[PDB]
Amino acid sequence: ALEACPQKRGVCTRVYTTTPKKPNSALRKVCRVRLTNGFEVTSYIGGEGHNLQEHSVILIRGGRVKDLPGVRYHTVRGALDCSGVKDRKQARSKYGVKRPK
Amino acid sequence: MQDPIADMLTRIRNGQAANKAAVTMPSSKLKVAIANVLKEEGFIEDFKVEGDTKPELELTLKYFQGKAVVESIQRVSRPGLRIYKRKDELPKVMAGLGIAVVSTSKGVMTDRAARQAGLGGEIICYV
RNA sequence: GCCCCGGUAAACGGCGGCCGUAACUAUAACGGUCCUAAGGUAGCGAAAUUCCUUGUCGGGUAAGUUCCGACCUGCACGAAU
RNA sequence: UCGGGAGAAGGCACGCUGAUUAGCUCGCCUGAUCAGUCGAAGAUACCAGCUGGCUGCAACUGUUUAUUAAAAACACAGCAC
RNA sequence: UUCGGGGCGCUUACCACUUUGUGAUUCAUGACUGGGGUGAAGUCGUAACAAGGUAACCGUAGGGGAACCUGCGGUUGGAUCA
RNA sequence: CAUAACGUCGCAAGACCAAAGAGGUUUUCUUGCCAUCGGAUGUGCCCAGAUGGGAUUAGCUAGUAGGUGGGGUAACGGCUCACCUAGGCGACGAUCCCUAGCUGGUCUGAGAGGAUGACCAGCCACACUGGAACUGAGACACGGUCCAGACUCCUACGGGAGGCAGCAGUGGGGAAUAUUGCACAAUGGGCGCAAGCCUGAUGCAGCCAUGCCGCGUGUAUGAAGAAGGCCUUCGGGUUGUAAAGUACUUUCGCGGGGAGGAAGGGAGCGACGAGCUCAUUGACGUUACCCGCGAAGUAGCACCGGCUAACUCCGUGCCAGCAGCCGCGGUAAUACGGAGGGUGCAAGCGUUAAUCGGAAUUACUGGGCGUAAAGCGCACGCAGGCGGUUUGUUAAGUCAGAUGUGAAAUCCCCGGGCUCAACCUGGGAACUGCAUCUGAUACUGGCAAGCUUGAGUCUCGUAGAGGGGGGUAGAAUUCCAGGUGUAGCGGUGAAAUGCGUAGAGAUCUGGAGGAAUACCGGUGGCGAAGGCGGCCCCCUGGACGAAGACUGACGCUCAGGUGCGAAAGCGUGGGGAGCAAACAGGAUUAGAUACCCUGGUAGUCCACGCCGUAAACGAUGUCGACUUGGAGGUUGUGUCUCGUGGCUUCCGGAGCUAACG
Questions:
Q1: Which class for B115: exposed (0-12), middle (13-18), buried (19 or more C-beta within 10 A)?
Q2: What UniProt keywords apply to this chain's record, in alphabetical order (chain B)?
């Protein structure tokens, strides 16, 4: 986070998929982000589905993904272009999802 | 030597370990002053000035079954680093059982003797 | 003296074909299998010694068949030739 | 190879006139000081290096086609047989 | 102006910032290049462990994906009932 | 231009130099002026100590250090100038580079200490960017001035006006932080004799759960026990007195009342003086608070595998996903999703980021180094650190008494005030360090005197492969010469290559050369280490014992420095029997660019020059004192079947070590 900041905005460079390590197997969704800090790191995209393109531009929280070595940050859904998970009836605090009527 | 007081103390510590009747140590007013509290406290039978030409201090050690009269004795104030305690700083060795000899302006005295007089000084050693 | 034998290279030199492996493909790299013994180990390349060639990638420049660096199967590099 | 490279580079001054100081035995010898003053320009004529960097070749001085080539060509101490 | 002189003005020495030459340092970018870390089942051989099925270590030298191998010399903190 | 209270300047005990009224209840006061001394307060300057990180920042400096004179200023000073001298500074770190306003305090911690310095208070430095000076008690001065630069706006372009890092606000930035509000009456400030004027200083309200504290969403009653959901051995159990329902109170809201926070100017008495008396006037608010009336009247969020307190069913199925760490999921999952239930907390609840100890993991209090990380390879030696016994002076360190300082606030204790508390008030207690005065002086230090049991020396003896130079034997290998000779020799796991009847191998004799030193040798000895071993001579170091004769503590260690320091390979010259990297071939093998066999270069050997390293290992530096002995050996002495001194081994008391030792 550089300036020891809780969060840090940035613009996605590419939204590709990655495969877990030896014990796990899947297509985890990640994305290279060029934070304002001046660093280009990879962040994980929580949720069952997202809408992050090339010029996504999202805020970074910070969290390592055990399965994906290198991914030390998590994207904050519900902020900027990163739309909150759809139909999230559960932990809406995370994934940034407004409580349905 | 470098620290005569420590020497004397050691010469008695090693002497008691071998259970020797008496032990010699180069005389010195300060030494005698120390030996004085040792005899009064009951750590030694007493002492006497000896030596044909060189003044010595024949220390007559005493022992008892089970434990030795002088279980422990070590110098805490050394030439490398001197230590001074205030009236309230005087530490109680083994909650009274054991005592400590301090050197104050009033003269060489034990923790209780110094505590009573109301003065502190250089903590010579603990016994 | 020669035939014959042997020492000497501060005389002429030589260093292929195949298979497996591997790579997204082709090559080089390593071992072997065969032919004729070996098949280039220690060192060195598109070099004033490479034709094809302004070879390919790239720096540099608005643009350089020039230059520099690398790769390099170097038409016919190499140890007092 | 500390000998050098180096008058590297770069910058300033450098006229005349008056009155003086210092070095010396002295010079019609030399080095300076203060003040005044003229021109666009004072080493006002005359003599007199352009400089820095990269690359190739041969080490260097030297030698060589007297009448077209001095060159990376020859020679060289050293090394070796 | 009581002429004694003063003020205006003029000229001159000194002066941020800038320019030129050189030197030191930091930063962004960068050909080409070196090795490294990490990633269930690619590959060549097989070095070590393992007294285990050819002893180890060491200085130095060369090589090799590597631990390490090999060469020369040394040590044993060298094996074994003969 | 006058007077001199005085003050200034020379010498010594002389001469020079000053200053505006006005108003009135006007012969009396009021305001003000000039000169001097003092008071009050605020400052300029100087000095001791203290004040972050890096030496991959070490030699630096010419006004640079000092002197004389001068200039300059309110004043000291190279501050500046002329002349003279040549110094000044540095490993107690200058110079250079980097960073950050500093402090009282704040947070944390048992303390020490660490981190921080945002609110409030003190100081310092900055207002378009940069520089400068003037005027003044003071600003080198935001709404003063001058010059340079960019930008914005105005413009008949000729030329002008500005600078929100002032308040509010706009746009841009960011995860994110507010009313372009009300008001001066109160408190305080500037000016004025006063009246009075100015005062977004401040006092308040607004916005935001950002925090803290207080309060409400109800109280009592109510089934062996509804319905519904859930579980079931379907017998029943659970959610539950929980809801419904009954009674009661009744936050909001409505009506009425309505605050503290504030006297003079003026007028009357008195001389419109002192003093006394009397009268007029308020933001937040019509809010707080009081009284009356009066309806039950929002709750959510996180979590339930373990640490962590709180469980089942269903769905999904190493798929989807979870995850701080250990992990979980491939058809029975309390750790995935939902539901019922449960725990925690409550308008709050979670999440993310940041700070603290535990760490005795830099250990001063609190640590270690033979093998787990860790003694520098050795010696010499500078600075520095430390230093034996007795006496005297000083008394700097150290210790003691008194006194000054140590701002407020804060912290701690007690009491008090707002209904409690937060908050606030009063009092009380502790305080290192530093200055001053006085005193003690045992210990350290300094000065002076003195002493041998340390160390060194002398004399007489002793053992040793200690070191350097030169000179000296025998065995064996190879080659050469002579003699004599057979058919094989050689080599291997087995063989082959190879050599052989112009003759080697094997054998005898003679000669030459290089290198090494077969028993003794040892489990031994010497050297500082590496290393070093036939004998003789010369040169030279260390060391031990006796006699106690001489000097007399002159010591210990030691950053830097200096010197020494195996092997390897390297440079030049020489040499080269043997051996032997690279390498030439023959074998082995799946392959062998190894091991085995045949050749073979550098090198190995000598002279000179080079480096500085190593399991340079007892992987445990030197000196002194203290702590059972037994046994073997080297050397001196002694009353010598043993005592004693030094040296070299082994076994072992106590003790030490994680174990080995």
A1: middle
A2: Repressor, Ribonucleoprotein, Ribosomal protein, RNA-binding, rRNA-binding, Translation regulation
Which bases of strand F sit closer than 7 A to a protein CB? 174-175, 301-303, 318-325, 327-329, 337-338, 350-354, 386-390, 398-400, 440, 442-444, 453, 625-628, 653-654
* Distance separating alpha carbons of residues B93 and B99, to the nearest angstrom: 5
Give the experimental resolution in Å.
15.0
Angle at the Cα of A14 from the Cα atoms of A32 and A65, rounded to 5 degrees: 40
Beta bridge partners of A60: A8, A75
- Work out the angle between the directed axes of helices B29-41 and B4-17 (0-180°, nearest 10): 40
Distance B33 CA to F364 C1' (A): 31
Looking at this protein, which amino acid is placed at residue B55? Answer: P
Report the structure determination method: cryo-EM
Query: What's the per-residue H, E or C state across chain B?
Result: CCCHHHHHHHHHHHHHHCCCCEECCECCHHHHHHHHHHHHHCCEEEEEEECCCCCEEEEEECCCCCCCCCCCCEECCCCCCCCECCCCCCCCHHHHCCCEEEEECCEEEEHHHHHHHCCCCEEEEEC
DSSP annotation of A45: -
B87: its two tokens: 């009236």
